Structures are given as C-alpha cells and as structure tokens.
Amino acid sequence: TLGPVVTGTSVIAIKYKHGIMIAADRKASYGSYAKFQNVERIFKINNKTVMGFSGELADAQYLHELLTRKNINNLSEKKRKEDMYTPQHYHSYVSRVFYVRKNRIDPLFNNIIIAGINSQKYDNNDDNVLLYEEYKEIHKDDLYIGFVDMHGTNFCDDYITTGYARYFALTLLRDHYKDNMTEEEARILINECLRILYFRDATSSNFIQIVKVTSKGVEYEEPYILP
Template structure:
C-alpha cells in the first residue's frame, strides 16, 4: 500500500538542519565550532582598569624643535611604588615616543615599535621610522585594539623632526589622533594647558633655552598640584642636530604653604 502525503505532518530527511541540531528523535550529536580561540577568550578576562599608571606628559613645539617632559614615577594605585620608570622612549635619531596612562600597556607599545624598527633594519633598504609614519602606525594599533574590545589604556605622544620641521602628535586609547603645537596628557591637560597656550600664542617663538625654562615651570606646577606627580623627571629635546635627554629634579618651595590656609 502506498503511503499518502500529509501536509500537516512534519517530514525531515537525513540532512535536515533539525536533525543536525539533535531535535526530535534524531541520534546525531552536533558540535558548534567556537567563534574565538582560547587565547582570544582569555583577553576578555583581563582588567580594563589601569593598575600601574604614569602621570602627565607635557610637550610643545619651539623654534627649531620639540621638547617633551615626563616624570619617572609608576603609581601603584595611590602608592608611589616604582620610582625610576622613564616614559619617554627614543625610537631613532629623529623620532621620540612618550607614553602616559597604563604602564603595562605602554611597555607593550614600546616592544611592538622596537620590533617594527628592528624589522626595518633587517631589510636594509634605507627606510627609517619617521615621526609621521610612527604617528600613523600608532593610530592603527590603538584603533585595532579598541575594535577588539581590549584597548590599550595609554595616551601616546609622537614627536620629532619631519621634513626638517618640528612634528608633534597625540593618539589616545580609542585611536583618535591630532597634531598640535602644544599637547598635554593626564591632569596636565586641565592644570597647565590653559596658561601655557596663552604664553605660546601671545609671545614670539621660543628658543631652545626659553623652551627648557618654560618646561621646568610646567613640571614644577604639576608637582605642586598633582598628587600623582614626582620630583624627578626627564626632559627630551629634539632638534635637527639630534636628540638630547636631561635628568632633572624639582626643587619645591613650600614656604608659601602657610599663606594658603583658609582660602576655600
């Protein structure tokens, strides 16, 4: 006797999706391939809160070069734990990298850049990482990590000499970037940027000595007002002649403290 087709009865063949997902009376076992590897899954378990952080970085353009400064403190929360962590990194004779924020992410960025520089040297084609090239590369790196929902919680400042002209740019943790003659990160963006911008806009271009003196004033003001600042800091000056580093220490004057009582 021939079987009759009943349109109200479900019929499934051997390759039906319902059978593959073990629905009904099927004995098939379906295994779903993971959408991410174990390593990628572990990334999401990493902290998104910086643990060891560096404070502000200050940088501006002067007549003939760029000057940067940052202290050498790594703060473990509110504890001034690591007191000799330079945050200004020389990439080559004309390119400088300065970092603020999460210092473990800063180390990751420095290692990635050093690997890129070494790769360029191995190729022996005469190419060199220029400030503009490093600036563009950092935007891609930071934006890539942000799209992976695992951002590098660090602010990057790239400085140097590009086509015989001073170059200064910043890339934040989201990959947003801009170029400017004055850049501050951290709390210096609120405490120092206003009055320094007024000085730089309303005066003639500073020479190297004047720029260094002004940078010392900036760091001293930050040491007074930023509770995560440190007395010892490094200054980097980039000109056509090369890169110069100086290790300095703030000499504070707290004699004015008694006169600031009851001023709230």
C-alpha cells in the same frame, strides 16, 4: 589590560626652534602608592622620534616593543636616509593599533604621544642604534607632535600635553606659547608647568626627565625642580 594598576602620569611635548622638548616626570604609582620613582617613560623609537607615555605602564613596554621592532624592520630595508619612518608614520600606525583594538574591547589604556622631527634635511645616514657642535634651526613645520587617546582619537599640534597636564599645563601653554622659542625659554616654560603639576597633581612628583629631539639626535637630562 583589564584595569590600570601601575600608571604613569602627564607628559608635555612642545616644539621650540631647535627641535622638540618633551618632558615627563619619572614616577609610576601603584594606585595610591608611589611604588616606582625612577621609571623612564620617554623612549627613543628612531634616531629622530621619541614616544611619550601616560596611563598604565604595562602597555608602554608593550607598545615600546611593537615600535622598536618595527623600527629595525625599517632599519634593515634602508638604502637611503630618506627611507626612514617619519614620526608621522608611527603616529598614523599607533593610531591604527589603538583603533583596531577599540573594535574589540581591549584598549590598552594609554595616552601615547609620538613626537619627532618629520624631515630628512640633516645628515644622519649611519644608524648606531645599539651604541652611540651646534643645533640647526627647524622650520616648525617639519616637527610633528602626535597624540593618541585610548579611543583612537588622534591629531597633531604645536604642543601636546597628555594625561593630567591637559588641565593644568595646557592653560599655561595655550596663552604663553609662541612659535620659535629658544632652548632656555622652553625649559623655563616647562619648568613653570611641571612645578604647577607637582603642586596640584597627586599622582606626580619631582625628578623630571626632559628629552630634546634636535637636528643632531635625542638628548637626555634629569633636572630636579625647585619649588
């Protein structure tokens, strides 16, 4: 928490019609040395939310533990499916964690993104957290894409890219993103963002992990971009 040594890189989290599509490369670099090239930086902290990550890796695995145990604290005191913690709650809670530390001078260098489905209109009232058809349309207003800078700066949009894509993939998104995209439309748009990052961003690589938060759950897959 004195300085970042094992740092992640940019993540991108847009929302398409079936749910969120948050993507991130899988490299953590020990400065200028690609020490780890299979690290995962998109964790599931609920059956309906994920949590992005950028900056130093030592603090995700910190902030992962904080949420993942708050989640079970919810999961113990849940009687109805509407008692779950909406992704808004976490992003308003993570914002507190970053802000309260800014009162001190230990910020836990990060650019956490909180993304998930902020609604309960789709039955998942049986939580198999320990061990785990068609998508449903989502009103694009029930999807919450948070963001928290290491100064506490927080907000939500339709698409939040953090780390270093904020200069590269943000320009593509700001002029090619339209509401209610589709499955293959989002992936090719993101693949046209990361392919831009992989070319111009030194601290980023291939071997993308793409996570989609749909009406049925959180799904994973590991593409490998073709230049």
